[PDB]
Amino acid sequence: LTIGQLARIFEISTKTLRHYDAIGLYQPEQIEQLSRILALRRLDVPLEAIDRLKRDGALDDPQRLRHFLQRHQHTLREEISARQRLLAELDRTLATLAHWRIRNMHARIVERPAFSVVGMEYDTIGQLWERFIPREHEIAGKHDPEVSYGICAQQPNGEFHYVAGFEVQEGWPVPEGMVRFQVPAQKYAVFTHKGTAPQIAESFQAIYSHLLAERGLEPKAGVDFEYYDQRFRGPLDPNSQVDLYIPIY
Amino acid sequence: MLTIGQLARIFEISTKTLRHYDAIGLFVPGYRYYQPEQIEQLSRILALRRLDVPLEAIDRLKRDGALDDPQRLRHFLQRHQHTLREEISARQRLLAELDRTLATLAHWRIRNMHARIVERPAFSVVGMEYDTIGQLWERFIPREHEIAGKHDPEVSYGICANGEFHYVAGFEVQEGWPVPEGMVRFQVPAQKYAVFTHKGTAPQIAESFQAIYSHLLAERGLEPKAGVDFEYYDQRFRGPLDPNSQVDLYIPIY
Amino acid sequence: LTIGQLARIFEISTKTLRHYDAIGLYQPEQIEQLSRILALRRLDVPLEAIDRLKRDGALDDPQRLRHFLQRHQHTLREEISARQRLLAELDRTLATLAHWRIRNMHARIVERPAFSVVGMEYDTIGQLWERFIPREHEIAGKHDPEVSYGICAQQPNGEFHYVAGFEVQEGWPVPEGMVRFQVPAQKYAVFTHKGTAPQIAESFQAIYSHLLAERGLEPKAGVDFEYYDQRFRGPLDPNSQVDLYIPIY
Amino acid sequence: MLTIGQLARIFEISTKTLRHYDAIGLFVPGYRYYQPEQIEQLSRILALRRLDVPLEAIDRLKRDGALDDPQRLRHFLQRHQHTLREEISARQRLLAELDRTLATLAHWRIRNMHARIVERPAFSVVGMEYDTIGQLWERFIPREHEIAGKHDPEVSYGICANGEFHYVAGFEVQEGWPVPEGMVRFQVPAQKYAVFTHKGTAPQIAESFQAIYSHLLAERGLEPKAGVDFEYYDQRFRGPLDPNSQVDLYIPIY
């Protein structure tokens, strides 16, 4: 077979072989050497080793190589084993994160009067976010358009409720499918959450378990909401930071 | 002291979920008031359903040990830990022997590959040229009914030809009709072939290709000639990625 | 060939072919049809499934069993991913339990007079006991034979030290190899360890971290020690606990 | 505030390791005492060389950012944990690639075996009958000398035969000698064989033995008769798990 065509498949290179000359390195047995090699190019063996692997021995001896390429498998799975126990280490090292996460989450006491939000009202609370943010600038009378609230009122049933909306001047028309919620005048303990939305809840568990009791604050069955703003870049980006406004006495 | 709706906001759950949890005697608390100190003893539940563990083996733990004994609740999940890895460890060895059985069904037919001998005269085939099968066969299908002079339109040719490839996807033609742009036409000469019927997909014929030239010619007893190889896509072929396909590979012979 | 020969090669039972009689499941064509079955049943499949999955077929036909076996790889593989995710979370879950026992690691203040310990002493720590426990009743005149002590004198260089001994009435001879150490009188804060031996240092940072400071104690550079009584049956059994006696002012 | 000695102690490390760390300016705090708030900073530094993170990567993570900010190091760790499982995955699909070459290795000799044709008369040999090879293929060797009337001593046999299995690893003997105890004798009759000098190991034969009755007799055209087959050890054989040794196998032929 000629030199130009003996470049089988599928990505060359031709001098691939001319390379494979120098002091080293259509016969039918002048292939299985290449066949074995080609993967090989799946183990990444230097060539100089792949010369040592010439006739001293061996030429072919698929005999040896069956134990050889699983002796490796022994090495390469020990490589996988070492990096997995490194990974298992990691998953535990990423626990010291959560509880330093929280011990630094300080509370600031904020009193804010009654204001009026307009937005969409509630299976999930994320969805509304999926559904609402094409309807952003459909609302006029904005104080600050960057901030948005995730209102949650405690009904005497008791069962959920949430509204994704914006603080707006009261007196403007509300679009179809939206609702006007009037947040009353409350005074809040504000926690800065630094994480994603599903682990906002595990911050809520830290609040109502001890983080309020270490500063002597008592929780209040009022209107909880989370303060979104410019320091917010995604619900599952583990770098967003929100403020959780939690009512107190 | 908190209420059933605040815990729902805390845990992202249903009020019926806890109203059910009260009925069993699991997590009890008209004035339903829960203690903030038992918020963890609950999350030490809502962390086990997330580990599909049934909801009365818990309630059996609640009084053997253990739900409230923290040195006991890591023994239980470290056993569930190692249970899951051995499940994973079973199924990763399931995967190891899942591949070694994707090579022996590889090389089974390759041996059982059928072979005809056809000597075919020189013919002309117009088409497009040169990244793989599909990089040239879609930019064709919409340009196959604009080709005139076709001998058989239900057969297509994939020609294999300094030393670079000259792969041409085209149609056998009767001469005297012209070729569009930027189509080309290739002179395939009169030669003798070993046609091997391949039953599979486009990525896995290139192993059907090195198999012949490997030991398949010899064992069949024929010698390769330096000419022009090519694949033959008959009717019997239905898509380059359909596995139940059937193509032909024509290989020059001395 | 015979129903004998038909019973060779594969690690086969006679019950398996009496099995396959009235089910519907003597020529070298019946050699791979019955060899792909010992190829999936190597991957935990059903059987009656692949019954008529071969009277349609494929009987053999490896064009299909390709997508199928890659189908099955998917399925598996999905399983293996799904259960790593559980282990990942599952790790995270053992954090809380880590701290719940730390938060419940109460200090005890204990004043103990100067007592006499003798055993072995010293670039490692854990290998010291496997040589000593054998030599355990060599020692004579011990107060409580059940309690070992892992002493760690504080040297002022600071070079370590460490002794694994018993407490005996002074004046008893001391087997070759071991020495006698006198710890002085001190008052200590005692923290009970629930866990294993490489976990012991995990408590040592928490103690010298915040656990002394909230309890309003100051620690003093002296002779600390680890105390093993029964409630200890293995440096790896995770249910033994050791009382870490730390000096305080 | 603390002492270099008890610090070290609580981290279960050495003191020269902390004087290691100080000299650079990394963890820099004659009576140098350190405050306890630097403990958790070191439980985060010592937790990074368990990840084999260079001891300079950091420091630049020190006065730059960011070693003690709990959300921008979960970033770090999140990446590093990606490329860690990205490296798993490389290999993890590579040892799916090799572990699928576990069959390609095979068939190449299997196709390039050899088969002589022998006709042999009935013989006899004895040892122990039927726990695999090694559970019997080893009791012996200390009992090879008990037999007398060895025919060729460099040659050992493993016979296979209402119906089930029936191995026996013997030697060929001239008749008229005492067979030990509880050793026994076996008589294979005069029959037709084809000999495949396998070049592998003893666990490796069971599918080379599977290959020959599968198709190799049909390719070579031979056919088997309901008799007794066996395997032949010679100067060839070197070890039951020795790869490079070649062993021969006798199967009945018509």
- Decide if C96 and B44 are in contact by the 8 Å CB cutoff: yes
Phi-psi region of C19 (alpha: psi -120 to 50; beta: other; left: phi over 0): alpha
Spatial strand order of the sheet with A107-112 comes to A107-112, A186-194, A241-247, A223-228, A148-153, A163-167, A115-121, A179-183
Residue A125 Cα, gap to closest chain C Cα (Å): 23
Q: Are strands A223-228 and A241-247 parallel, antiparallel or unpaired?
A: antiparallel
The number of distinct structural domains making up chain B is: 2
Of the candidates D85, D108, D246, the beta carbon closest to that of A62 is on D108
Of the candidates D40, D75, D109, the beta carbon closest to that of A239 is on D75
Q: Are A105 and A192 in contact (CB under 8 A)?
A: yes
User: What CA–CA distance (Å, rounded) separates D187 from D206?
Assistant: 23
- For chain C, list residues whose CB is within 8 angstroms of any CB belonging to chain D: 1-5, 7-10, 14, 28, 31-32, 35, 123, 125, 152, 154-160, 198, 200-201, 204-205, 207-210, 213, 219, 221, 224
H or E stretch including B86? helix B73-99
Beta-carbon contacts of C108 under 8 Å, excluding residues fewer than 6 positions away, are: C189, C190, C191
Same structural domain, B118 and B71 = no
Residue with tokens 């030599």: C135
* Residue D179 CB-half CA count within 13 A: 17
CATH number at residue D15: 1.10.1660.10
Same structural domain, B131 and B226 = yes
- Decide if D50 and A89 are in contact by the 8 Å CB cutoff: yes
Cα four-point dihedral sign C244, C249, D1, D4? negative
Q: Where are the beta strands (DSSP E) in chain C?
A: 107-112, 115-121, 148-153, 163-167, 179-183, 186-194, 223-228, 241-248
CA end-to-end span of chain D: 92
Q: Are D41 and D27 in contact (CB under 8 A)?
A: yes
Q: What is the resolution of this structure in A?
A: 2.9
Chains that touch C (3 or more CB pairs under 8 A): A, B, D
Q: Which two tokens stand for residue D234?
A: 């010679």
User: What CA–CA distance (Å, rounded) separates C222 from C215?
Assistant: 19
User: What CA–CA distance (Å, rounded) separates A106 from A191?
Assistant: 6
Question: Strand, coil or helix: what is A248?
Answer: strand
Question: Strand, coil or helix: what is A75?
Answer: helix
Same structural domain, B20 and B142 = no
Angle between helices C64-92 and A62-93 (to 10 degrees): 30
DSSP C102: H
- Residue D92 neighbours by CB distance under 10 Å: 18
Residue A205 Cα, gap to closest chain B Cα (Å): 6
Q: Which two tokens stand for residue B93?
A: 């060895």
Q: Nearest-CA neighbor of B141 among B153, B124, B159, B125? A: B153
Residue B160 Cα, gap to closest chain C Cα (Å): 24
- Please list every residue in chain A whose beta carbon sits closer than 8 Å to the beta carbon of residue C99: 99
- Residue D59 neighbours by CB distance under 10 Å: 17
**Alpha-carbon distance values, D143 to C75, D160, D174, D175 (Å):** 52, 20, 18, 19
Q: Are strands D156-159 and D168-170 parallel, antiparallel or unpaired?
A: antiparallel
User: What CA–CA distance (Å, rounded) separates B34 from A230?
Assistant: 36
Question: Strand, coil or helix: what is C131?
Answer: helix
- Please list every residue in chain D whose beta carbon sits closer than 8 Å to the beta carbon of residue C152: 9
Q: Which two tokens stand for residue C183?
A: 């710890």
- Please list every residue in chain B whose beta carbon sits closer than 8 Å to the beta carbon of residue C241: 71
Angle between helices B73-99 and D73-97 (to 10 degrees): 40
Same structural domain, B136 and B227 = yes
User: What CA–CA distance (Å, rounded) separates A130 from B93?
Assistant: 41
- Please list every residue in chain C whose beta carbon sits closer than 8 Å to the beta carbon of residue D10: 201, 204-205, 207-208
Residue with tokens 């998917």: C74
- Decide if A60 and D105 are in contact by the 8 Å CB cutoff: no
Q: Nearest-CA neighbor of B8 among A161, C3, D117, D171? A: A161
- Residue C237 neighbours by CB distance under 10 Å: 12
From the candidates C73, C74, C209, which should be mutated to test the interface with D, based on the most D CB atoms within 10 A? C209
Question: What phi and psi values does residue B250 have, to the nearest 5 degrees?
Answer: -95, 125
User: What CA–CA distance (Å, rounded) separates C66 from D95?
Assistant: 19
Residue B202 Cα, gap to closest chain D Cα (Å): 19
Residue with tokens 């033959």: B232
Of the candidates D71, D85, D246, the beta carbon closest to that of A239 is on D71
- CB environment D68-90: b (16+ within 10 A), e (fewer): eebbebbebbeeebeebbeebee
Q: Are B38 and B21 in contact (CB under 8 A)?
A: no
Residue D102 Cα, gap to closest chain A Cα (Å): 7
Of the candidates B77, B98, B199, the beta carbon closest to that of C90 is on B77
Of the candidates D71, D97, D200, the beta carbon closest to that of A63 is on D200
Q: Which two tokens stand for residue B95?
A: 């995967």
- Residue D10 neighbours by CB distance under 10 Å: 25
Give the ranges where A94-192 is alpha helix by DSSP (H).
Answer: 98-103, 127-132
**Alpha-carbon distance values, C229 to B215, C102, C106, D106, D236 (Å):** 73, 20, 18, 60, 63
Q: Are C235 and C126 in contact (CB under 8 A)?
A: yes
Bond preceding residue C53 cis, omega within 30 of 0: no
- Please list every residue in chain A whose beta carbon sits closer than 8 Å to the beta carbon of residue D114: none
Q: Are C153 and C201 in contact (CB under 8 A)?
A: no
- Please list every residue in chain B whose beta carbon sits closer than 8 Å to the beta carbon of residue D101: 103
- Decide if A77 and D84 are in contact by the 8 Å CB cutoff: no
Residue with tokens 């001319």: A18
- Residue C45 neighbours by CB distance under 10 Å: 12
User: What CA–CA distance (Å, rounded) separates B254 from B191?
Assistant: 9
CATH number at residue C179: 3.20.80.10
Residue with tokens 């000259």: B166
- Decide if B9 and A157 are in contact by the 8 Å CB cutoff: no
* Residue B36 CB-half CA count within 13 A: 17
**Alpha-carbon distance values, D239 to A115, A216, D137, D167 (Å):** 88, 78, 11, 18
> B45: which strand partners?
none
Same structural domain, B116 and B218 = yes
Question: Strand, coil or helix: what is C220?
Answer: coil
- What distance lies between CA D60 and its chain's CA centroid? 45
Q: Nearest-CA neighbor of A40 among A21, A22, A23, A20? A: A20
Cα four-point dihedral sign B15, B20, B23, B26? negative
User: What CA–CA distance (Å, rounded) separates C9 from B2?
Assistant: 71
Q: How many residues does chain D have?
A: 254
Angle between helices B4-11 and B15-24 (to 10 degrees): 110
- Decide if B102 and D101 are in contact by the 8 Å CB cutoff: no
3-class secondary structure per residue, D204-220: CHHHHHHHHHHHHHHHC
User: What CA–CA distance (Å, rounded) separates C208 from C107?
Assistant: 12
- Decide if B70 and C42 are in contact by the 8 Å CB cutoff: no
User: What CA–CA distance (Å, rounded) separates B92 from B106?
Assistant: 21
**Alpha-carbon distance values, D168 to C10, C148, D124, D160, D186 (Å):** 18, 58, 12, 7, 8
Q: Which two tokens stand for residue A7?
A: 């470049």
CA dihedral B235, B237, B238, B239 (to 10 degrees): -130
- CB environment C147-165: b (16+ within 10 A), e (fewer): bbbbbbbbeeebebebbbb
Residue of B nearest to C78 (CA): B91
- For chain D, list residues whose CB is within 8 angstroms of any CB belonging to chain C: 2-6, 8-12, 14-15, 36, 39-40, 43, 160, 163-164, 206, 209-210, 213-215, 217-218, 224, 226
> C247: which strand partners?
C188
Residue with tokens 């990840």: D51
Same structural domain, B246 and B131 = yes
**Amino acid found at A159:** E
Q: Nearest-CA neighbor of D239 among D131, D153, D156? A: D156
- Decide if D214 and C31 are in contact by the 8 Å CB cutoff: yes
Residue of D nearest to B220 (CA): D219
H or E stretch including B117? strand B115-120
- Decide if D214 and C154 are in contact by the 8 Å CB cutoff: no
Spatial strand order of the sheet with D230-233 comes to D116-120, D191-198, D247-252, D230-233, D156-159, D168-170, D125-129, D184-186
Residue with tokens 């000398």: D145
- Decide if C158 and D8 are in contact by the 8 Å CB cutoff: yes
Question: Would you call B8 exposed, middle or buried from its count of C-beta atoms within 10 A (0-12, 13-18, 19+)?
Answer: buried
- Please list every residue in chain D whose beta carbon sits closer than 8 Å to the beta carbon of residue B108: none
3-class secondary structure per residue, D169-194: EECEECCCCCCCCCCEEECCCCEEEE
**Amino acid found at B239:** G
* Residue A201 CB-half CA count within 13 A: 14
Q: Which two tokens stand for residue B232?
A: 């033959």
DSSP B213: I
Angle between helices D73-97 and A62-93 (to 10 degrees): 160
**Is residue B103 a part of any domain in this protein?**
no
Question: Would you call A133 exposed, middle or buried from its count of C-beta atoms within 10 A (0-12, 13-18, 19+)?
Answer: exposed
Question: What phi and psi values does residue A85 have, to the nearest 5 degrees?
Answer: -70, -25
Q: Are A36 and A68 in contact (CB under 8 A)?
A: no
**Alpha-carbon distance values, B142 to B79, B155, B224, B226 (Å):** 60, 16, 36, 33
User: What CA–CA distance (Å, rounded) separates C80 from C90?
Assistant: 15
- Please list every residue in chain D whose beta carbon sits closer than 8 Å to the beta carbon of residue C28: 213-215, 217-218
Q: Are B84 and C87 in contact (CB under 8 A)?
A: yes
Beta-carbon contacts of D239 under 8 Å, excluding residues fewer than 6 positions away, are: D201, D245
Question: What phi and psi values does residue A214 have, to the nearest 5 degrees?
Answer: -75, -15
State which residues form the domain around B37.
Answer: 2-98
Q: Nearest-CA neighbor of C99 among A97, A107, A216? A: A97
Q: Are D226 and C1 in contact (CB under 8 A)?
A: yes
Residue of A nearest to B46 (CA): A202
Q: Are strands B156-160 and B168-173 parallel, antiparallel or unpaired?
A: antiparallel
Bond preceding residue A95 cis, omega within 30 of 0: no
Task: Tell me how far apart the 2 most distant CA atoms of chain B are, in Å.
Answer: 96
Q: Are B35 and B1 in contact (CB under 8 A)?
A: yes
Beta-carbon contacts of D97 under 8 Å, excluding residues fewer than 6 positions away, are: A39, A42, B99
- CB environment C1-37: b (16+ within 10 A), e (fewer): beeebebbbbeeeeeeeeeeeeeebeeeeebbebbbb
Q: Nearest-CA neighbor of C119 among C139, C100, C102, C93? A: C139
Same structural domain, B17 and B74 = yes
The secondary structure of D104-169 as a DSSP string is TTTTTSTTS---EEEEE----EEEEE---TTTSTTTSGGGSTT---BS-TT-EEEE----S---EE
Q: Are C165 and C140 in contact (CB under 8 A)?
A: no
Spatial strand order of the sheet with C241-248 comes to C107-112, C186-194, C241-248, C223-228, C148-153, C163-167, C115-121, C179-183
**Alpha-carbon distance values, C38 to B161, C5, D107 (Å):** 43, 17, 19
Q: How many residues does chain A have?
A: 249
Residue B162 Cα, gap to closest chain D Cα (Å): 33
- Please list every residue in chain A whose beta carbon sits closer than 8 Å to the beta carbon of residue C87: 91
Question: Strand, coil or helix: what is A85?
Answer: helix
Q: Nearest-CA neighbor of B32 among B43, B46, B22, B17? A: B22
Question: What phi and psi values does residue A245 have, to the nearest 5 degrees?
Answer: -90, 115
Q: Are C102 and C203 in contact (CB under 8 A)?
A: yes
Q: Which two tokens stand for residue C184?
A: 């002085």
Residue with tokens 């001994």: C165
Chains that touch A (3 or more CB pairs under 8 A): B, C, D
Q: Which two tokens stand for residue C173?
A: 């001879």
Question: Strand, coil or helix: what is B129?
Answer: strand
Question: Strand, coil or helix: what is B160?
Answer: strand
- Please list every residue in chain C whose beta carbon sits closer than 8 Å to the beta carbon of residue A94: 92
**Is residue B104 a part of any domain in this protein?**
no
Rg of chain B over CA atoms, in angstroms? 34
Beta-carbon contacts of D13 under 8 Å, excluding residues fewer than 6 positions away, are: D46
- For chain B, list residues whose CB is within 8 angstroms of any CB belonging to chain C: 40, 43-44, 47, 50-51, 70-75, 77-78, 80-81, 84-85, 87-88, 91-92, 94-95, 97-98, 101-102, 104-106, 108-109, 199-200, 243-245
Q: Are A6 and A28 in contact (CB under 8 A)?
A: no
Q: Are strands B184-188 and B229-233 parallel, antiparallel or unpaired?
A: unpaired
Q: Nearest-CA neighbor of A153 among A163, A143, A144, A145? A: A163
User: What CA–CA distance (Å, rounded) separates B58 from A153?
Assistant: 33
Same structural domain, B150 and B233 = yes
Residue D205 Cα, gap to closest chain B Cα (Å): 16
Question: What phi and psi values does residue D212 have, to the nearest 5 degrees?
Answer: -75, -45
- Please list every residue in chain C whose beta carbon sits closer than 8 Å to the beta carbon of residue A96: 95
